[PDB]
């Protein structure tokens, strides 16, 4: 029913926030160590695939969210949550999955940074247009803006230092990379135990038919439609995979923050667990596709 414990005190969620921040820092450092700048500039030379993929994602994801909201008879708050979470730009999870499938990594990072930069302006545009009848207010000032630029800095700076280190001192990369890995492991366990401290009652939030169906389709719809549109426009196999997997994934932090700021906690009680569930589903799909992909290259 109501929020478990008291969210006002915020006992340990600061620790969860800082652990996630440091994990993103380490991941972006490793990713920057992975890639090279010349191929990034080459991708900037012909953004045709990148531009069409990005505009296709921003055109299909909000429309798919609106269609799901119309079909599954979600309430106003849940429909707004679907609309906001669906049209969010690509997060670091897509970059980690790109590590998993090791396909055209710098294209993935350029796509995610361009998606964030353009979403900074498209959030009011997409929210004002696609939310007629839900939240009659304009909500053009409730979209986070400091958070988006903070995320942009946190995704560019470690990549910048990694790409500078690799392009000038290529002999010390793997070593520090290995160190990052073990640190990740430690941070990883912290995450889960801290999630326990904030596990609450996620079963109460889960309304099986509508929520489960929306979660099942939306990342799957993104993956499938991105793959199909990449295949249609004559894209490379690595490009196809990375584009499909970037469009399928999204970001959940801004969705949660805007939901918190727009509505009082009592109205959005269970919805506080929606983004987390969203995350715990997309990964549950992501790795699964990887498990298929290896088989696709085994034969």
């Amino acid at each position, epitope marked *: 029913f109501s929020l478990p414990h008291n969210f006002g005190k915020r006992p340990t969620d600061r620790a969860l926030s800082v652990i996630l921040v440091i994990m993103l820092l380490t991941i972006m450092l490793s990713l920057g160590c992975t890639m090279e700048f010349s191929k990034i500039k080459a991708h900037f030379w012909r953004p045709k695939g990148l531009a069409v993929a990005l505009v296709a994602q921003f055109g299909i994801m909000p429309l798919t969210a609106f269609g799901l909201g119309k079909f599954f008879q979600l309430n106003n*708050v849940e429909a707004l949550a679907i609309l906001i979470c669906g049209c969010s730009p690509g997060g670091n999870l897509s970059n980690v999955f790109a590590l998993a499938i090791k396909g055209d990594m710098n294209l993935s990072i350029v796509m995610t940074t361009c998606s964030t930069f353009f979403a900074l302006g498209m959030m009011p545009l997409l929210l004002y247009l696609y939310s007629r009848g*839900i939240y009659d*207010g304009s909500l053009k000032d409730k979209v986070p803006y400091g958070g988006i630029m903070i995320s942009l800095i946190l995704i560019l700076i470690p990549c910048t230092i990694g790409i500078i280190l690799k392009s000038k001192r290529p002999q010390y990369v793997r070593y520090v990379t290995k160190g990052g890995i073990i640190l990740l492991l430690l941070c990883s366990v912290a995450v889960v135990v801290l999630s326990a401290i904030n596990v609450g009652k996620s079963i109460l939030f889960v309304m099986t038919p509508h929520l489960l169906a929306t979660s099942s389709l939306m990342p799957f719809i993104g993956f499938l439609l991105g793959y199909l549109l990449s295949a249609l426009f004559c894209l490379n196999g690595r490009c196809k995979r990375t584009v499909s997997m970037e469009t399928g994934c999204a970001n959940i932090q801004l969705c949660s923050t805007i939901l918190n700021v727009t509505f009082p906690p009592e109205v959005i009680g269970p919805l506080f667990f929606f983004p987390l569930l969203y995350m715990i589903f997309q990964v549950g799909e992501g790795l699964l596709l990887v498990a298929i992909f290896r088989c696709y290259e085994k034969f």
Partner: antibody
């Protein structure tokens, strides 16, 4: 149960600058929004606008956009209305109503006692 | 905007004859996403604050008499009473909240002679 308290009857000269206070202590103030309804004597109800005390979000009707001004106070759990432009025809009964607001105001499930305002010399 | 009009605006029923208040609104104020049919039927006794009777144009607040009942969809709505009595003489407005909060003209109930 929840009840709404109004300031009471008020007489004011046509020089305007009048204030109305509606207090609500029966529930969590920020969870519900407060609408203001105007009723001239014998001409039916008329909506003015609502205020969300959580984010202080005020929405006004087109007719009352120029005159109406809605504010809220969390510490006192109250809502204030100011008009700052009164004529001899503005004498009417004003009600503050509480409505649930998920994304769209549902209905006025509880009303205030209503305060009568008169403008004359 | 949306404007609503109530047709009779005046009725006279003595003891048991059922009443029928209908306001046809202007546009289809029915939500396609959810079958809520945003509409509220209120009651205004003289010298008193309005009291809510029906919400979603089909359901009633707990505690109201069961004689009141409202049925409608799209733009056609109708409030009826199985048996009217002395304290049923009031004014009804059928407010809507689909797009903007607008009230109807109002229907007055009297006692016949």
């Amino acid at each position: 149960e929840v009840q709404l308290q109004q300031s009471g009857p008020e007489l004011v000269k046509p020089g305007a600058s009048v204030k109305m206070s509606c207090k609500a202590s029966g529930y969590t103030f920020t969870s519900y929004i407060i609408h203001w309804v105007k009723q001239k004597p014998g001409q039916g109800l008329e909506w003015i606008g609502y205020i969300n005390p959580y984010n202080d979000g005020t929405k006004y009707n087109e007719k009352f956009k120029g005159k109406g001004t809605l504010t809220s106070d969390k510490s006192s759990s109250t809502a204030y209305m100011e008009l700052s432009s009164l004529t001899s025809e503005d004498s009417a009964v004003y009600y503050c109503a509480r409505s649930y607001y998920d994304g769209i105001p549902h209905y006025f499930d509880y009303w205030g006692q209503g305060t009568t305002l008169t403008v004359s010399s | 905007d949306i404007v609503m009009t109530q047709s009779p605006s005046s009725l006279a029923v003595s003891a048991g004859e059922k009443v029928t208040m209908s306001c046809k609104s202007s546009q289809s104020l029915f939500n396609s996403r959810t079958r809520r049919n945003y509409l509220a039927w209120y009651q205004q006794k003289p010298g008193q604050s309005p009291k809510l009777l029906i919400y979603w144009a089909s359901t009633r607040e707990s505690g109201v008499p069961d004689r009141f009942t409202g049925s409608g969809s799209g733009t056609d709505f109708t409030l009826t009473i199985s048996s009217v009595q002395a304290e049923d003489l009031a004014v009804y407005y059928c407010k809507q909240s689909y797009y903007l909060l607008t009230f109807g003209a109002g229907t007055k109930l009297e006692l016949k002679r």
